[PDB]
Symmetry: D2
Subunit: 494 residues, 4 copies
Amino acid sequence: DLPVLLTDLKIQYTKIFINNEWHDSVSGKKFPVFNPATEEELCQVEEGDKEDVDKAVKAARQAFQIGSPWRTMDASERGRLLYKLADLIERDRLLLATMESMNGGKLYSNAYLNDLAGCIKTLRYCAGWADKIQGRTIPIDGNFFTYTRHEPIGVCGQIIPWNFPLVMLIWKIGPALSCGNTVVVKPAEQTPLTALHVASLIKEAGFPPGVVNIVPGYGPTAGAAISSHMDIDKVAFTGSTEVGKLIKEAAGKSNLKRVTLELGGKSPCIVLADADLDNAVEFAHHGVFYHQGQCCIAASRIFVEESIYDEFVRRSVERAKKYILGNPLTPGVTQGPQIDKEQYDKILDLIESGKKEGAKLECGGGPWGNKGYFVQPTVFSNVTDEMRIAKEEIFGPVQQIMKFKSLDDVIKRANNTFYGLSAGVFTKDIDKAITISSALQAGTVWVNCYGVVSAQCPFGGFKMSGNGRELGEYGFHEYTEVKTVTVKISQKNS
Amino acid sequence: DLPVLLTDLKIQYTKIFINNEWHDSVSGKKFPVFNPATEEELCQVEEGDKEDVDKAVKAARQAFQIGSPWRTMDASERGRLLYKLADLIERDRLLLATMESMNGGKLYSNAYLNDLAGCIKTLRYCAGWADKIQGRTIPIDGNFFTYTRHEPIGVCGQIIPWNFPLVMLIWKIGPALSCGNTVVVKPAEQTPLTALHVASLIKEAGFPPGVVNIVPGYGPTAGAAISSHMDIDKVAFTGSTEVGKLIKEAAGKSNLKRVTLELGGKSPCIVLADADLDNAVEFAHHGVFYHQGQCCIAASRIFVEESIYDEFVRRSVERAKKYILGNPLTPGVTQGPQIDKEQYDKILDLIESGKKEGAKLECGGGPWGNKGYFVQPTVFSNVTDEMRIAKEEIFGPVQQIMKFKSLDDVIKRANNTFYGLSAGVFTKDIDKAITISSALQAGTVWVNCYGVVSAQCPFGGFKMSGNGRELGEYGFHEYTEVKTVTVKISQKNS
Amino acid sequence: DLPVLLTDLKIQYTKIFINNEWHDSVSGKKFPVFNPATEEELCQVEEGDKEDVDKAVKAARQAFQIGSPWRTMDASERGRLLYKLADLIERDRLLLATMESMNGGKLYSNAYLNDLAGCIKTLRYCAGWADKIQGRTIPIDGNFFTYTRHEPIGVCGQIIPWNFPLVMLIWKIGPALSCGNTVVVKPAEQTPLTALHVASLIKEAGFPPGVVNIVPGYGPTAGAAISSHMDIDKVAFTGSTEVGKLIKEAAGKSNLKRVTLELGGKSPCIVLADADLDNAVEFAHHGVFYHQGQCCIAASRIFVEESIYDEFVRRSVERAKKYILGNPLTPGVTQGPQIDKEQYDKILDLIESGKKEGAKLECGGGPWGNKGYFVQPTVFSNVTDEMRIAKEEIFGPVQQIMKFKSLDDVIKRANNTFYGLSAGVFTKDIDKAITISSALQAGTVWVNCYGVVSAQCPFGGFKMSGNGRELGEYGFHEYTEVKTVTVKISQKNS
Amino acid sequence: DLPVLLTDLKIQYTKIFINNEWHDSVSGKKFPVFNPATEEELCQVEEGDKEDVDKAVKAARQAFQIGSPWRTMDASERGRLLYKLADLIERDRLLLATMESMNGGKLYSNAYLNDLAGCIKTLRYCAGWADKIQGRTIPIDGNFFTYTRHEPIGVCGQIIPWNFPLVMLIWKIGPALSCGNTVVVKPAEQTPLTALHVASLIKEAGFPPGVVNIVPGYGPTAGAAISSHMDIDKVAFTGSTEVGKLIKEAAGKSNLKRVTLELGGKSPCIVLADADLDNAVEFAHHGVFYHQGQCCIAASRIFVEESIYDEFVRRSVERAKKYILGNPLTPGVTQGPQIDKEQYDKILDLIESGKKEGAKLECGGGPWGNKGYFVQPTVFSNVTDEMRIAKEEIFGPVQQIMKFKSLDDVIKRANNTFYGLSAGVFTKDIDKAITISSALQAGTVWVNCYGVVSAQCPFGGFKMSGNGRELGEYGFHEYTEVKTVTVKISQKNS
Ligand SMILES: Cc1c(Cc2ccccc2)c(=O)oc2cc(OS(C)(=O)=O)ccc12
Ligand SMILES: Cc1c(Cc2ccccc2)c(=O)oc2cc(OS(C)(=O)=O)ccc12
Ligand SMILES: Cc1c(Cc2ccccc2)c(=O)oc2cc(OS(C)(=O)=O)ccc12
């Protein structure tokens, strides 16, 4: 069932959100927000800067003070507010999905069925952790009672990307709030709108003022303001590896704020000769082309055993040739635009290198339409490892297919990158599945599938693909600060 | 029982340790190592630089390769090697304690009874975790089998401080090795000798070559080489907050290597009127004066309720006046020297500010002897919060005592620093103990004691006192990298 | 806010619940259900026997089969059904509380504000555990991949008591269902009605048929049928210790079904001379008198230090003399009836022993009214340890107060019973709180409070007060069965 | 390397062990101990009865008292004593293995290389858990601080079987002691000797008196005395399911002592057509024949897919025909005797049913030698499900091989028993391995192997094969008793 909105969407929420109220910017400047499919302005939004990030942090610091409503409420009540927020997002599913699709150039079917479902489910998962975050009692040497508290860290700055604005906002605020933190969120400059609606719903749900504050604006101003702030306890960021380094660096020079990063990838698949060929083609295809390739985990290097390489390529190219480009909102459309010009250019520039450096172009390889940031779906075969398209994250609808005949060698090739976000392994053989997945330097390894992500599973990168994990039980650790309390006693007993 | 060595100590191990063999430096340069109590040179040691750190990392990378002895051995066998190392250190306890005392200016009674005991015990604790590091099986949405592996991260660079050379070496290598990592260790320039002996014992115990490599030398050369290295997966460092920032910053600009830091403090005690006065005086005294004040957790601000302030000061000053300064090796001596000139000067300079800014000097306040870096034990009363001695980590034998009459206010004062390593709370009242320890922004809070540290308890700072925790169950997390494996299945069942 | 029902309650659900449908008994026999406050019949209910328990187990076995909807649905969806059930109970709060009050002789204010709140909250807690139940990956010796599955056990028989019919039904079915088990529930013969309504709501919420089956009837027939059944995997029971032994015994002789038991107590409080006297009197009072003493954890022995014993007794007797006996439904009424004749008699018989064996009766000591099972609230001072009232669980509104002057001795006295469900310790002193709570042989120890029970906290007895724990993280273990899977591999790597 | 003892073994330890001293029996009766391979008496041992079990429990109760050395020592020191015991067993490896072989009819190569290795390794694993047993801090609703203590339960009675006397003694006492319990052990009547030696080593290692007490004697006297004792907190037992029921029943009628049971099996293997045939034959063979079939997990029903059934049988029969029967001590001997007459008879009686009920005898089927309890290794093909040999645990060297062609059906057949200790699955296919292992009602499922057991992995049965798990992290739970402590506070903060 794909239901839709009955009325034109009206943009209501466009201001900075601090202490459960709407603020104009300290400058009074606003900034435009566009539709990537039309290149038309959708609205203007208040533009946040350091001056406004400062107001947001003070609000967050105050809401985090010992004795506040957010610090003193039962953990179960933090959970209740989170499940209430999920019910509210569910109520506004049609509206939010349309806004997500229209603002982020995202297929509406995906937006409604996938993004909004994952968003609701992830919130509900996190709600359930709130009163199940526990410390320890510890049999310390000597006559002492020792326990630990897994406290909230404090004010967490959270920079959200444009590829999955709602899902990534919830991946960040869900755990942070479940653990009792307060947050200052900076949505992507390209995609501030759905977060501002969520803020309206955070107010409606009854979170105490200052527990969530949302500051739209630009990265090198409001984002830098966050990453360099002297009273922000932790920064979480998803985006390019290049910007990741700037954030980690800025944390070090400012106040040694804790850092977690979810960054790019150049994620490989290894397809063995004994693999279910059709299943491998389908997952590797969707693996790289999903949301116009604008996925951190994009299966951007597909290594296929020589004896099935030809047949793999052929079937892959056929599947790539089936797309219908156009407005994400129109039913039947199966590929939307890229998010913006900066991105559009890098992608076309990378496609050019593919041709020049002599990969075999099977289909695509140029732009589409008179407007919108559209790129034809592109497939390159006979790709080699020093080629730009084999080394650089494209973040576009561009697939690389390469051959191998030696398993040891292809695992070295798969591992020979500074990235390490994810990988895929396609085989029917028990031993190979286990041993190859073990040998890959990748945070998530899929076997006989790709792109399977859920709230129950921790997620993050090896190497320059990230620091830390998000979600699952393990990801919840990075929103706590552990305090050990050791009490002198007259005599301990086991 | 305080037994001692029967023979003059001979310095045997003075070279760089890589692949279980002894290397001269790539330059051929050596550097001197002094006794802080005599200011005499004890020996020369091979001087490591970037060029040698490079050799050490390659060794560590190779020993970490899939299919290596260190990667393939049973976890229980990693544990066995660690308990073997502990037995070997125990065998060489007299020798090691003497070397520690002579090189680090550390009282021999402490060195033998405390440092070496904690060292053996911490190793044995860590040995026990090795085959008890576990991932999870996870009930992911959809028809998939999902599990996680808590893998070793890889090559860990470990920079060790001079205040507790053996204990901190074991606090770092114990967990790192228990989890299956390989290490490149840089002992302090001041105190490389006991680590080089431990390396001899690592070879004797039979660790595979390249699993532990030790590179003595200077911080701004070999330390920078570590923190900026492109194939080092993680850096661990204990030391000043100032250098901590440089390390975190360098990680960001290089390869986004994971970072954990254990840094300075300006740790406060709050002594309530209802406290056991003698117990509070004793713990607060030893709390700040231990190892010549050269403790990250030094109880450097003692806040005493007004009605007992006078009596607290008097008793504190009496206890401070009981010390016998001299050679750490001579029995009966109860205060050794500071570690070196850089430190000696900063401390005297900070004592001068105390006098100028008008704290009340109860005793001490100048140097001692014709040689050695000795500082008289110093007590300041009527200290105020803007005074240098109240804000800056002194890392010397200097105690600050201040009064309070308002509990809310004194907790704000206790929390009003960028540090947050530890704190102490002295009271007999159940409610106050729990509520004050909860409100302190400090990683370890002691109640009716101070300085109680053990392998079972995680340890680290809030704020600019550190990132991460060491030891306990929780500290073990930071030497693992979590990998999620998600396998497509025909149908799952609970 | 104490809102109430606007219309006469109508009893709708009175049949056996199997496969989401309503069954008459195989015999066709029904049995009466009474109001303990009037002694009037409220209705008749279908009477379950072995023959009907058999139908229920077959339904539960089928719903547990590999490949069923309950086995294959996402864990998160088990959670969703549970939170849906909680919303439904919340919707029917007025109705359910009235039914609980009218059937179980339970004060309506309590029923509405406490029982129904705990019921909703506990369900929501359990919903949150469903997709957070996880096994392990284990670094086994040798070349193997080993993981564990924490599976549901299977068909769980659950015998519910009459004192807290709704709360105990949810304490049992919440965890059982969250973990993926199927259940055959036997509500108390006295109080089957609220469970039958809940079953209607389980159908409405959309649980698959056979996942929950409810068989009202008698203990020595339907209860024995459960405890002795050859295809029931586990039995959970709350009630008398005496019946507990019969159940455990029957499990052994039948099919070695797993057993958890929550049984009686003779729970002591130790009140120290330094205690907040008013707080101790209040909690110890409510501790024993709550729900007409019909609490497993009833604070039935209160040990007060001699120097405050007199004053403790006086204040306790004053508080006991303030009750208003009558219909649980009438506002202002503060004590309802006991549940039935069997219980009424045992209580009066135990009050008689109190008088005969020469305890000092401060107030109460006889029955009340012309109808209903009412007992005057009774206080006995100068109670000694061999007295019946000091040894036997009364399960009535009868308080025992005894003196002590030696702490070591009173802890031996507190521990000198075969029971061990709970205890209370009242003092302001940190050391005494910790050391006494450690030395008590009791599953839950309260300090400066009593009767504080919540879903987050595991609960159960030492000794003959129970086997196992319910709720919290730990209680969830007893509704799982651990399976280890060990897979041969060519080579493992850490 | 198979080294051996240089001198005749001398039996030294033959008395009851209580409070680290050697007791004659209260009766003065002794009982004989035989060599199953010669049928000659090896010695006499003091015979324990209820009267002696009583002395042992009082010792254990006293050593468990609050304030005792065992209750107050650091957990790390419990660990140290355990690793000391392991070193001592290692020192006496030759002696112990010879005694095990001579007393238990166990091949010396196995005894020395397998039993004693597992014994040392399991002790060392358990030593490592001692100071890593931890409770929780819990975010309870309302203004309370709640923590849990995972205490030792208390006096644990531990009944050890004759098949693996040393390994099972350590599987029981290792965890029990690591958690801080005291134990009263009853070794098998057939095999008391190695346990009595271990007791000598427990004294040597310096465990406090009364922490371990060993009472040799008979099951229906000393075993019943344990299972029915009113001051024994828990009973652990490995043996027949039939006796298991008696124990569980007796616990219920006495003092509701906690129970864990590790019992028989009729464990199946499913061998798929795509399996590595030679690997399946080898593991299934050793799976059932190991230690003369005297294994709870004996692979006693082997289901092979029809198209490989013939070839599987042939290869299996060939491997069975290769044994050399004789004295377990003589090198080259590959099959020892069964343990005793009771067992010998049941096995021969079960082999007779095999012939009568018309299974196809491939080899074996009668006794061997003029003395010793020897049974020829026996293989039966064309076995059907109602045959005695397919339903009853034989506990002898007798293999059953049956065919299947339907996977759904063979899984029903595999699951159609009241047992459920273990199972094996042989296939190369990822999906089948996971889905079949999930569908088996068995506590341990091996894939492409069999009989792989280690300290890191929890172990126990589904159904009538056991209650509870031993070893791994999970098994450690069953030697703790959880106590919740809930403290009233003025205000909580997250
Ligand atoms: C060992 C030790 C350390 C070093 C350390 C810190 C954290 C984790 C491991 C080691 C310290 O900094 O101060 C101390 C101060 C003491 O004296 S006191 C404060 O008890 O009187 C006793 C022991 C230490
Ligand atoms: C809910 C409740 C129960 C039932 C229960 C026990 C364990 C786990 C779940 C439920 C009880 O036995 O006594 C109580 C006594 C109270 O009064 S007090 C002791 O606080 O004054 C308040 C609430 C209860
Ligand atoms: C040690 C052992 C045991 C005893 C045991 C069971 C569970 C937990 C601890 C000990 C067993 O019953 O069968 C076995 C069978 C083997 O042979 S196989 C099945 O690998 O070919 C090898 C070793 C054993």
